[PDB]
Amino acid sequence: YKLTLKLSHVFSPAEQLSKSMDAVAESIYEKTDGAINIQTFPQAQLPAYKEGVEQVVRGAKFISVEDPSFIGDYVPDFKALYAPMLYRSFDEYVNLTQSDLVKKMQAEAEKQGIKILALDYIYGFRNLITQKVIKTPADLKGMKIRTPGSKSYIDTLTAMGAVATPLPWGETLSAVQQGVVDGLEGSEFTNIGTKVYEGPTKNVANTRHILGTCGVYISTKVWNDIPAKYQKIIQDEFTNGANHMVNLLKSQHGGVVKELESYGVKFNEVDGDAFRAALKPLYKEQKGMTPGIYQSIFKELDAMRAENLYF
Ligand SMILES: O=P(O)(OC[C@@H](O)CO)OC[C@@H](O)CO
């Protein structure tokens, strides 16, 4: 048995997302004795964002690695999973992805032709990156902030008080340099990995408005033709790779902040409650969502927090 798969994502070689995909692909190749050959293609040189997910839906020999908002048009519950200001830590989100609730969402994705291998390639809390000290939604008035091109991001930055400007990453950094947008948003790992800090935007507001994470998607039609012994290896290696990425970035974050600070980046806290109030209206069911999905998510998060507090 032989299968070759093209894996596409938008990240740069210096970023851990890219390094993790390479490591997992190599591990799977080795552990399957060459039977499963996943080749990686960084920096959106192949179809990416929704175009990558489209290849998956259309049954290509393809793995798309994108945040869950990019499967939300096909499986609307994933819009709720990627809602803003839900998660307080990487661990909360990992825990939620292991819940029966999220397993049910994965089953919904399979019915739409999308096999989800992971949801928790976490690349960090996304923060505002601008030339200003932003503390409240009022501070964002008139500021054009680049976001990725999905409704989740557009709605989030709009509700936060900005002029959301949805653009692929490739159209972003020069746009920031030229003032076509006033800033952007992303994790400290994105900031350092793509050298956002070498540009004019060296103020980071710790809004943590979205927990940036990639899922890993493959067509059910392709998946179902893979012998079970190789399915298990592919699945185990993607799960292990996510765990490693999450633990690594958790470890690195303090150092990354210090290194960014050494390059002149200045971090500030925000009025969290003010941003939470601005965003609360976004927790509304959209067509195709499971009735009560937000309430179900909140119930899980509340329970894990309650148990943590107790112990
Ligand atoms: O802000 P984006 O377009 O986030 C997209 C990511 O969520 C994948 O779907 O890119 C993040 C960077 O780290 C890419 O180099």
TrEMBL record:
Transmembrane segments: none annotated. Keywords: Signal. It holds the Pfam family DctP. GO terms for biological process: transmembrane transport. The keyword Signal applies. CDD domains: PBP2_TRAP_TM0322_like. InterPro entries: DctP_fam, TRAP_DctP_sf. This is TRAP dicarboxylate transporter-DctP subunit. The lineage of its organism: Bacteria, Pseudomonadati, Thermodesulfobacteriota, Desulfovibrionia, Desulfovibrionales.
